[PDB]
Design an enzyme around this catalytic site. Structure first.
Site, PDB file in Angstrom:
ATOM      1  N   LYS A   1      45.306  -9.640  30.477  1.00 29.57           N
ATOM      2  CA  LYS A   1      43.899  -9.799  30.152  1.00 29.57           C
ATOM      3  C   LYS A   1      43.122 -10.090  31.424  1.00 29.57           C
ATOM      4  O   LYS A   1      43.431 -11.040  32.135  1.00 29.57           O
ATOM      5  CB  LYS A   1      43.675 -10.935  29.154  1.00 29.57           C
ATOM      6  CG  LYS A   1      42.225 -11.050  28.719  1.00 29.57           C
ATOM      7  CD  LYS A   1      42.026 -12.120  27.677  1.00 29.57           C
ATOM      8  CE  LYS A   1      40.577 -12.189  27.251  1.00 29.57           C
ATOM      9  NZ  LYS A   1      40.077 -10.898  26.701  1.00 29.57           N
TER      10      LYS A   1
ATOM     11  N   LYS B   1      38.833  -6.847  29.664  1.00 35.54           N
ATOM     12  CA  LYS B   1      39.650  -5.642  29.496  1.00 35.54           C
ATOM     13  C   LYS B   1      41.089  -6.128  29.354  1.00 35.54           C
ATOM     14  O   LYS B   1      41.400  -7.234  29.775  1.00 35.54           O
ATOM     15  CB  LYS B   1      39.543  -4.737  30.735  1.00 35.54           C
ATOM     16  CG  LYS B   1      38.136  -4.598  31.351  1.00 35.54           C
ATOM     17  CD  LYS B   1      38.162  -4.776  32.874  1.00 35.54           C
ATOM     18  CE  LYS B   1      36.788  -4.656  33.510  1.00 35.54           C
ATOM     19  NZ  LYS B   1      36.246  -3.270  33.461  1.00 35.54           N
ATOM     20  N   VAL B   2      41.963  -5.318  28.768  1.00 31.45           N
ATOM     21  CA  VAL B   2      43.388  -5.666  28.670  1.00 31.45           C
ATOM     22  C   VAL B   2      44.244  -4.467  29.050  1.00 31.45           C
ATOM     23  O   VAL B   2      44.025  -3.364  28.551  1.00 31.45           O
ATOM     24  CB  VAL B   2      43.793  -6.147  27.261  1.00 31.45           C
ATOM     25  CG1 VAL B   2      45.282  -6.508  27.227  1.00 31.45           C
ATOM     26  CG2 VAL B   2      42.957  -7.337  26.843  1.00 31.45           C
TER      27      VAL B   2
ATOM     28  N   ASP C   1      38.442 -20.558  16.178  1.00 32.77           N
ATOM     29  CA  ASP C   1      37.949 -19.181  16.020  1.00 32.77           C
ATOM     30  C   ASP C   1      38.997 -18.287  15.366  1.00 32.77           C
ATOM     31  O   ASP C   1      39.283 -17.187  15.839  1.00 32.77           O
ATOM     32  CB  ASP C   1      37.491 -18.614  17.370  1.00 32.77           C
ATOM     33  CG  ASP C   1      36.593 -17.375  17.230  1.00 32.77           C
ATOM     34  OD1 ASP C   1      36.092 -17.074  16.120  1.00 32.77           O
ATOM     35  OD2 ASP C   1      36.391 -16.693  18.245  1.00 32.77           O
TER      36      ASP C   1
ATOM     37  N   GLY D   1      36.712  -4.290  25.484  1.00 36.01           N
ATOM     38  CA  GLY D   1      35.925  -5.501  25.209  1.00 36.01           C
ATOM     39  C   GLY D   1      34.589  -5.534  25.933  1.00 36.01           C
ATOM     40  O   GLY D   1      34.206  -4.564  26.588  1.00 36.01           O
ATOM     41  N   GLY D   2      33.886  -6.661  25.807  1.00 39.88           N
ATOM     42  CA  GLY D   2      32.552  -6.851  26.399  1.00 39.88           C
ATOM     43  C   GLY D   2      32.549  -7.739  27.635  1.00 39.88           C
ATOM     44  O   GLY D   2      31.857  -7.446  28.616  1.00 39.88           O
ATOM     45  N   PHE D   3      33.316  -8.828  27.582  1.00 44.00           N
ATOM     46  CA  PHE D   3      33.525  -9.702  28.748  1.00 44.00           C
ATOM     47  C   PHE D   3      34.944  -9.593  29.330  1.00 44.00           C
ATOM     48  O   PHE D   3      35.287 -10.331  30.261  1.00 44.00           O
ATOM     49  CB  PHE D   3      33.168 -11.175  28.427  1.00 44.00           C
ATOM     50  CG  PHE D   3      34.061 -11.842  27.393  1.00 44.00           C
ATOM     51  CD1 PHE D   3      35.299 -12.386  27.750  1.00 44.00           C
ATOM     52  CD2 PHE D   3      33.655 -11.937  26.063  1.00 44.00           C
ATOM     53  CE1 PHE D   3      36.114 -12.999  26.801  1.00 44.00           C
ATOM     54  CE2 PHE D   3      34.469 -12.552  25.111  1.00 44.00           C
ATOM     55  CZ  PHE D   3      35.698 -13.084  25.481  1.00 44.00           C
TER      56      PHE D   3
ATOM     57  N   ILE E   1      44.822  -1.098  26.809  1.00 46.95           N
ATOM     58  CA  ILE E   1      45.038  -1.220  25.371  1.00 46.95           C
ATOM     59  C   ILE E   1      43.837  -1.893  24.700  1.00 46.95           C
ATOM     60  O   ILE E   1      43.516  -1.587  23.550  1.00 46.95           O
ATOM     61  CB  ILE E   1      46.407  -1.884  25.048  1.00 46.95           C
ATOM     62  CG1 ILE E   1      46.481  -3.339  25.519  1.00 46.95           C
ATOM     63  CG2 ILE E   1      47.528  -1.050  25.673  1.00 46.95           C
ATOM     64  CD1 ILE E   1      47.863  -3.780  26.018  1.00 46.95           C
TER      65      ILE E   1
END
Ligand SMILES: COc1cc(OCC#Cc2ccc3ccncc3c2)ccc1C[NH+]1CC[NH2+]CC1
Length: 316
Positions: free
Chosen positions: A38, A22-23, A130, A18-20, A15
């Site tokens: 995650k 995955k999910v 953040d 990402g860069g660092f 779903i």
């Protein structure tokens, strides 16, 4: 490695890109309950690994209706897996873009849930630091769930004192970011925006921004209270909870307290775990009470969620 994980979880579709990280959507085998997993790589994380572990530790101490629930942390040679509450409605980011901008009354409903989560985070002795639309997900009821690690990026949401590396209070930085969030909810673009980091930043430090004609007078007053460059002059969380704008449609202060706190162990869930693990009640309670965020924690918490949904408190 995946050996341990796949003993407990059946992996479905990705779903999260990402860069660092995955999910994956996954099923918790014992309860049949869906979770998001995650997946973070340690080599990728490098010397931020200890900071990530400190944040995971903080998440373990959060329990709240508008905060994504952690179920299980599993660490291996090269990976850390975080098993979390699956939020099917996606990012607030994508919702804002899909709608252009939200009505005042919808932004109020959503903003109250952000304030609820953040106030609770502060009450437990933490700050987010953040806040941005990528770190807020909708569940299937379109209620917001606060996350972190979602990805000029968050520079546009950073408070001036944060931006210049100086001393700051996390809570005050969160109020600023919530101000940027409020503007984007109602406008569908950022109050400070530019093509380069140096320019964006100069803008942030100056604190000047356009006020589109559709913003109500009361919205304008709240934005100026949240987006004060001097943190001392920024509105406090105390005054936000019962702000006139915040109560304009629903005349009650924000319900920030946890609605579902862990008090004592739920007897029905302990009962089912005892039969399953062929333990007596006392030894089962003693195991659960360690709160290791291992598979036992996960199973306990997922049985609790089953009970909340009126479902038989049963293991497959
Ligand atoms: C609220 O505090 C935290 C949240 C964290 O969230 C990690 C995550 C996630 C995630 C990603 C994609 C999903 C997709 C679908 N469904 C669920 C999903 C969940 C992680 C860490 C914290 C701790 N917090 C960090 C900031 N400082 C205070 C502590």
């Amino acid at each position: 490695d995946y050996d341990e994980l796949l003993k407990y979880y059946e992996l479905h579709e990705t779903i999260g890109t990402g860069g660092f990280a995955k999910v994956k959507l996954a099923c918790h085998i014992l309860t049949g309950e869906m979770v998001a997993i995650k997946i973070m790589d340690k080599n990728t994380l490098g010397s931020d690994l200890p900071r990530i572990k400190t944040e995971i530790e903080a998440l373990k101490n959060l329990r709240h209706q508008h905060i994504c629930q952690l179920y299980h942390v599993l660490e291996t040679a090269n990976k850390i897996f975080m098993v979390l509450e699956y939020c099917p409605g996606g990012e607030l980011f994508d919702y804002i873009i899909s709608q252009d901008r939200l009505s005042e009354e919808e932004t109020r409903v959503v903003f109250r849930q952000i304030v609820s989560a953040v106030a609770y985070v502060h009450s437990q002795g933490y700050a987010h630091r953040d806040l941005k639309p990528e770190n807020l997900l909708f569940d299937e009821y379109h209620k917001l769930k606060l996350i972190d690690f979602g990805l000029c990026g968050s520079l546009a949401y950073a408070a001036p004192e944060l931006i210049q590396g100086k001393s700051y209070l996390g809570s005050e930085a969160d109020v600023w970011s919530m101000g940027i969030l409020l503007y984007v909810l109602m406008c569908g673009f950022l109050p400070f925006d530019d093509d380069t980091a140096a320019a964006l930043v100069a803008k942030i430090m100056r604190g000047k921004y356009d006020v589109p004609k559709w913003l109500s007078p009361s919205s304008i007053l709240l934005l100026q209270q949240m987006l004060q460059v001097d943190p001392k002059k920024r509105i406090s969380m105390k005054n936000l909870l019962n702000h006139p704008w915040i109560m304009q449609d629903y005349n009650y202060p924000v319900e920030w307290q946890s609605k579902n706190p862990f008090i004592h162990l739920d007897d029905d869930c302990v009962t089912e775990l005892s039969v399953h693990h062929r333990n007596n009640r006392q030894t089962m309670e003693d195991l659960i009470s360690l709160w290791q965020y291992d598979h036992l924690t996960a199973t306990y918490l997922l049985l609790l969620a089953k009970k909340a949904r009126g479902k038989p408190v049963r293991l497959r």
